[PDB]
Design a protein around this ligand. Structure first.
Ligand SMILES: OC[C@H]1O[C@@H](n2cnc3cc(Cl)c(Cl)cc32)[C@H](O)[C@@H]1O
Ligand SMILES: OC[C@H]1O[C@@H](n2cnc3cc(Cl)c(Cl)cc32)[C@H](O)[C@@H]1O
Ligand SMILES: [Cl-]
Ligand SMILES: [Cl-]
Ligand SMILES: [Cl-]
Ligand SMILES: [Cl-]
Ligand SMILES: [Cl-]
Ligand SMILES: [Cl-]
Ligand SMILES: [Cl-]
Ligand SMILES: [Cl-]
Ligand SMILES: [Cl-]
Ligand SMILES: [Cl-]
Ligand SMILES: [Cl-]
Ligand SMILES: [Cl-]
Ligand SMILES: [Cl-]
Ligand SMILES: [Cl-]
Length: 333
């Protein structure tokens, strides 16, 4: 007997109701732009599959950000491009303005609207209670949008949120691991950075959905309000689940496992053993008390659930009391 089927509780069929060409990215064809219209100004950074630069469009002197892709599975290139095009005009999602070829390698170079070169991780351990709420809400706007457009981000982490703190503007970036959701489809669990991976990934449950992003989001919130980086500090994939189990307790883990009839190695269960739930209030210390409210803990508790189907949706999260006042922000710069 295999694992129990799952479908998203929200936006289940959004891709089903759209034309094939919306999501069948394997049959997309790229309309290239003129590389010569852009000139790189300076290097912002280099990562795994990319180098990112500041650049200018010399036709109108508009400053842009240019991400030059390093060689990857060509199917994945089409995937990211199609996703970014689909999402253009979404709230707090990076805007793909053009696509050009690298003069040297002829690899694709993605041209984006300009954004300031500061990521959330650089700021997020020193925000006020108010600003955590504010920026959490802005991230939710992005996630609800991309989920509503049938897209899982699958790499929600501090390093993937760019912030312009001066102008209170935030963009969700790094859509290279994003994927279209299709009910019934089994997905690769090698997504998301360790500290942000949901229990579904860690127990090899493949029929997951947008709710993975909500787990990652919860991991970000816990980090911010408790001033702990990362909140769940696993040393390997197995220990990531152990760390989660030492906070949420094993009782609910084995209930989740039993619910979806998941294939858990008894030798992993021996190491998991039994751990008591560690009430969310246990991670409060004098350092972080001014950040931890009953509404914060209620919210966190409702995001950080083993069972992906119990997790708040992005819309449900946006309606949570944690954001009750911050939605009234008066946009002071
Ligand atoms: O004069 C040669 C011009 O080629 C631009 N250039 C070099 N490598 C590039 C890679 C990319 Cl993705 C782009 Cl858009 C422009 C590049 C340089 O930025 C320079 O302005
Ligand atoms: O290696 C870390 C450095 O790389 C920059 N970076 C990585 N991916 C990026 C994507 C965008 Cl859109 C921007 Cl603006 C910067 C990026 C980060 O902003 C940081 O300056
Ligand atoms: Cl597909
Ligand atoms: Cl295109
Ligand atoms: Cl990160
Ligand atoms: Cl990006
Ligand atoms: Cl996949
Ligand atoms: Cl993948
Ligand atoms: Cl993995
Ligand atoms: Cl931990
Ligand atoms: Cl137990
Ligand atoms: Cl406790
Ligand atoms: Cl309080
Ligand atoms: Cl749970
Ligand atoms: Cl959602
Ligand atoms: Cl709720």
């Amino acid at each position: 007997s295999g694992p129990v089927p799952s479908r998203a509780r929200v936006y289940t069929d959004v891709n089903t109701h759209r034309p094939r060409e919306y999501w069948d990215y394997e049959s997309h064809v790229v309309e290239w732009g003129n590389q010569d219209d852009y000139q790189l100004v300076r290097k912002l950074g280099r990562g795994k599959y990319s180098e990112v630069f500041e650049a200018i469009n010399i036709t109108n002197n508009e400053k842009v950000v240019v991400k030059i892709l390093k060689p990857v599975k060509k199917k994945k290139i089409k995937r990211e491009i199609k996703i970014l095009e689909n999402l253009r005009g979404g709230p707090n999602i990076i805007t793909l303005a053009d696509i050009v070829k690298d003069p040297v390698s002829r690899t694709p170079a993605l041209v984006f609207e300009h954004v300031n070169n500061t990521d959330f991780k650089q700021l997020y351990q020193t925000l006020t209670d108010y600003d955590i709420r504010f920026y959490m809400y802005e991230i939710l706007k992005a996630l609800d949008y991309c989920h509503s457009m049938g897209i899982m981000h699958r790499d929600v982490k501090p390093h993937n949120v760019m912030i312009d703190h001066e102008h209170r503007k935030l963009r969700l970036i790094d859509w290279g691991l994003a994927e279209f959701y299709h009910p019934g489809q089994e997905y690769n669990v090698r997504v998301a950075s360790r500290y942000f991976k949901g229990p579904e990934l860690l127990v090899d449950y493949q029929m997951y959905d947008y709710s993975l992003d909500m787990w990652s989001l919860g991991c970000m919130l816990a980090s911010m309000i408790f001033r702990k980086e990362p909140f769940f500090h696993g040393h390997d994939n197995y220990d990531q689940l152990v760390r989660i189990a030492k906070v949420l307790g094993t009782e609910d883990l084995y209930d989740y496992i039993d619910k979806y009839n998941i294939e858990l190695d008894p030798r992993f269960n021996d190491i998991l053993g039994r751990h008591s739930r560690k009430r969310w209030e246990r991670f409060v210390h004098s350092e972080n008390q001014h950040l931890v409210s009953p509404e914060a803990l209620d919210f966190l508790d409702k995001l950080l659930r083993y069972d992906h189907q119990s997790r708040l949706t992005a819309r449900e999260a946006m309606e949570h009391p944690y954001f009750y006042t911050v939605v009234k922000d008066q946009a002071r710069m």
